[PDB]
Design an enzyme around this catalytic site. Structure first.
Site, mmCIF file in Angstrom:
data_model
loop_
_atom_site.group_PDB
_atom_site.id
_atom_site.type_symbol
_atom_site.label_atom_id
_atom_site.label_comp_id
_atom_site.label_asym_id
_atom_site.label_seq_id
_atom_site.Cartn_x
_atom_site.Cartn_y
_atom_site.Cartn_z
ATOM 1 C CD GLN A 19 -2.711 1.369 2.201
ATOM 2 O OE1 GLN A 19 -3.217 0.564 3.079
ATOM 3 N NE2 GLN A 19 -3.151 2.587 2.414
ATOM 4 C CG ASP A 131 -9.554 -6.318 3.170
ATOM 5 O OD1 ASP A 131 -8.920 -5.397 2.926
ATOM 6 O OD2 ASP A 131 -10.590 -6.900 2.749
ATOM 7 N NE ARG A 135 -8.022 -7.223 -0.959
ATOM 8 C CZ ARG A 135 -9.348 -7.471 -0.813
ATOM 9 N NH1 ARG A 135 -9.805 -8.219 -1.146
ATOM 10 N NH2 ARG A 135 -9.944 -6.444 0.072
ATOM 11 C CG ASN A 136 -5.917 -8.816 2.659
ATOM 12 O OD1 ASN A 136 -5.212 -8.056 2.128
ATOM 13 N ND2 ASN A 136 -7.223 -8.238 3.224
ATOM 14 C CG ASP A 149 -4.660 -6.022 5.037
ATOM 15 O OD1 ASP A 149 -3.918 -4.821 4.557
ATOM 16 O OD2 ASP A 149 -5.906 -6.180 5.446
#
Ligand SMILES: Fc1ccccc1Nc1ncnc2[nH]ncc12
Length: 252
Positions: A19, A131, A135-136, A149
């Site tokens: 990020q 979340d 993907r995390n 994450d």
């Protein structure tokens, strides 16, 4: 306290983009040279970006679990770095796609189980992730995944979409979607559907279909995660136990 001297860190190759900046692999020399992941932050010269970036580290020092990525330390002087445990095989989503004909059902259920242990641990600390998505998740080895994450409309519980309510029950909804992504080999939920049409579909009682080769007992567990009423959803402690039995019935 997690302050590390920069000279104890050796930067290696880039392993992906985060990020706030590039994520690198590297070595941490402490008094036995450990392979680490180094999160960088390009705009951390400004305190507003620095506080946001370092908040990830502040959150991570609270946790100690085998299926949650470990915080090794921080370098607070510019350029600001976050030192984390290295998960060599990278992001789960890409790992599932690549190994789509390599990984068997037992391995896929194992990852869901492992993630449920990490989520039961967080629930025990009264921590809401907000979340949970493939993907995390990071892959440490072929039989070891880690939660890593600390707007995804297609992963969100209806109360999160409608009211921005995030609770332990909304986290169970997202875990259901994460399990679906795992069993679908890293295919994104609601493909070809616009974000604004997702709430309407869910409100009509529509759910993600049973993935091919998914045991019906595992899919009924996912549907329990997708109860519209949050109070009807199971808690991670029940999910963890269920996933254990499903896993044993697959290994034999
Ligand atoms: F930022 C990324 C983008 C793609 C794949 C992996 C990463 N990031 C990572 N890879 C391995 N170990 C890690 N510990 N913390 C973060 C991270």
């Amino acid at each position: 306290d997690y302050e590390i001297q920069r000279e104890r860190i050796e930067l290696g190759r880039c392993i992906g983009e985060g990020q706030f900046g590039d994520v690198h692999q590297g070595i941490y020399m402490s008094p036995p040279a450990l392979a680490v992941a180094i999160k960088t932050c390009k705009n951390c010269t400004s305190d507003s970006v620095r506080e946001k970036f370092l908040q990830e580290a502040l959150t991570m020092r609270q946790f100690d679990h085998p299926h949650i990525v470990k915080l090794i330390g921080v370098i607070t002087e510019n350029p600001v770095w976050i030192i984390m445990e290295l998960c060599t095989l990278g992001e789960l989503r890409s790992f599932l796609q690549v190994r789509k004909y390599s990984l068997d059902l037992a391995s896929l259920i194992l990852y869901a189980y492992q993630l449920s242990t990490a989520l039961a641990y967080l629930e025990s600390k009264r921590f809401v992730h907000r979340d949970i998505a493939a993907r995390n998740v990071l892959v440490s080895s072929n039989d070891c995944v880690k939660l890593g994450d600390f707007l995804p409309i297609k992963w969100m519980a209806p109360e999160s979409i409608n009211f921005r309510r995030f609770t332990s029950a909304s986290d169970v909804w997202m875990f259901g979607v994460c399990m679906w992504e795992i069993l679908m080999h890293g295919v994104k939920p609601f493909q070809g559907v616009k974000n604004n049409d997702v709430i309407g579909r869910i409100e009509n009682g529509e759910r993600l279909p049973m993935p091919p080769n998914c045991p019906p007992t595992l899919y009924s567990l996912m549907t329990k995660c997708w109860a519209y009423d949050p109070s009807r959803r199971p808690r991670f402690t029940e999910l963890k136990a269920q996933l254990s039995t499903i896993l044993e019935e697959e290994k034999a």
